[PDB]
Amino acid sequence: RSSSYSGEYGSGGGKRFSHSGNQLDGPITALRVRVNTYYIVGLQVRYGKVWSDYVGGRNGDLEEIFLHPGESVIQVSGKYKWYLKKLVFVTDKGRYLSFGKDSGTSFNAVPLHPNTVLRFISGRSGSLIDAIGLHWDVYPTS
């Protein structure tokens, strides 16, 4: 009853992906974002102890952030122009995790219902991240 969805932010190219099935592996516990000179290139998210299937390209440097136990994302903002250019993940331990460059159209995603967190992502990808959507729900008890 508490789930919500923000998106889809970006353009309509590439191939759809969704981490809806990965929810069963656990809460989000880590993020990988690949970034090149121009764009957000790729994404991988750890659900419990299991990484999602990587989406995006091979170009660029990877950044890997491990969330603390019980830390979740409660806001995702960013920018896109043709493809995703910037992503900012804000956590409920007060951390701001920023990736990419400030150029393009801005978006800001927050959960519709209070006391919910980022449970999974979806979007579109190819050699880059074309679009992103954020799926919010209660933090998992089991």
Residue numbers in the entry: 22 to 163
The authors write:
Here, we describe crystal structures and biochemical studies showing that the CXXC motif is on a flexible tail, where it contributes little to structure or stability but is available to engage in redox reactions. ZG16 crystal structures also draw attention to a nonproline cis peptide bond that can isomerize within the protein and to the mobility of glycine‐rich loops in the glycan‐binding site. An understanding of the properties of the ZG16 CXXC motif and the discovery of internal conformational switches extend existing knowledge relating to the glycan‐binding activity of the protein.
Zymogen granule membrane protein 16 (ZG16) is produced in organs that secrete large quantities of enzymes and other proteins into the digestive tract. ZG16 binds microbial pathogens, and lower ZG16 expression levels correlate with colorectal cancer, but the physiological function of the protein is poorly understood. One prominent attribute of ZG16 is its ability to bind glycans, but other aspects of the protein may also contribute to activity. An intriguing feature of ZG16 is a CXXC motif at the carboxy terminus.
